[PDB]
Design a protein around this ligand. Structure first.
Ligand SMILES: Cc1cc2nc3c(=O)[nH]c(=O)nc-3n(C[C@H](O)[C@H](O)[C@H](O)COP(=O)(O)O)c2cc1C
Length: 147
């Protein structure tokens, strides 16, 4: 299958997460297209992919703020071709904040309102993702068995 991975990362944690997931899918034979949200255009972005994985860190503290590069995409999610698309979300955060990985929840909610098919519960990483690598690998495995 063909998968598209789009991620927004300020310090590289969600980017590290996206590349770990990308490598697991490619090792299984998928054709994987991994892009930073900063270089993407929302219009028709999901057209042609069997699976779309969206990753985003959570900022803001007292109010949720999506990772800076991901904002424009989130705002135009209506134009990407999400209706009937198999999607799954992931992201880095810290459980010391009130809205832990709140960006993952906001993106899942919008995707379900747009008619996408969420294939697996989102991956929510607490702290350094390098220390939760087995969980990232495990979630990537589960998504493949879900499409
Ligand atoms: C100022 C500040 C505000 C933050 N706000 C939140 C938050 O509201 N919720 C959360 O789960 N994590 C919050 N974080 C934690 C970041 O999401 C976390 O460091 C994450 O690993 C960053 O990932 P990235 O390098 O892919 O952008 C915050 C971190 C900072 C420094």
């Amino acid at each position: 299958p063909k998968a598209l991975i789009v991620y927004g990362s300020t310090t590289g944690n969600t980017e590290y997460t996206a590349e770990t997931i990308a490598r697991e899918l490619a090792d299984a034979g998928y054709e994987v297209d991994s892009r930073d949200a900063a270089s993407v255009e929302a219009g028709g972005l999901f057209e042609g992919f069997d699976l779309v994985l969206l990753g985003c860190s959570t900022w803001g503290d007292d109010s949720i703020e999506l990772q800076d590069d991901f904002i424009p995409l989130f705002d135009s999610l209506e134009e990407t071709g999400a209706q009937g698309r198999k999607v799954a979300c992931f992201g880095c955060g810290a459980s010391s904040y009130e809205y832990f990985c709140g960006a993952v929840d906001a993106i899942e909610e919008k995707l379900k309102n747009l008619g996408a098919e969420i294939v697996q519960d989102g991956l929510r990483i607490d702290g350094d993702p390098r220390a939760a690598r087995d969980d990232i690998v495990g979630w990537a495995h589960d998504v493949r068995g879900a499409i």
